[PDB]
Amino acid sequence: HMLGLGASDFEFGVDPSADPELALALRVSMEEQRQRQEEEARRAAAASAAEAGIATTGTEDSDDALLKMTISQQEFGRTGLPDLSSMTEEEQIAYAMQMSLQGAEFGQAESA
């Protein structure tokens, strides 16, 4: 007789030839996880072998750079305060006049 009668005896989990797409996906997935467990496995192998000996952990050559780069993204990201309801009458006025201080024939204020 033939062997064409395996409905539950084999759920496509015995031969990779049963599926070419799943075959390559199983080789790319297993190899991917290995690189993660390896790059992390050897990482502890060197971090513990030298223990902060070969890997420096204090490259603060530009202490002011950390002070500038930190306030550079926080200052430009805030630009003061866009929230109008969370600002006194002068607070929103400073931002409105700050933009109309260098060239302003009218301004963007149609209410108060």
DSSP labels for 95-111? HHHHHSSSS-SS-S-S-
Query: Which technique?
Result: NMR
Distances (CA, A) of 77 to 74, 81, 82, 85, 99: 5, 9, 10, 19, 17
Helix (H, G, I), strand (E, B) or coil at 83: coil
The dihedral through the CA atoms of 10, 15, 17, 22 has a sign that is positive
Residues 6+ away with beta carbon under 8 Å from 56: none
Q: Find out whether 12 and 19 touch, Cβ atoms under 8 Å.
A: yes
Q: Find out whether 96 and 107 touch, Cβ atoms under 8 Å.
A: yes
Closest CA to 96 of 87, 109, 86, 81: 109
CA–CA distance, 76 with 70 (Å, rounded to integer): 10
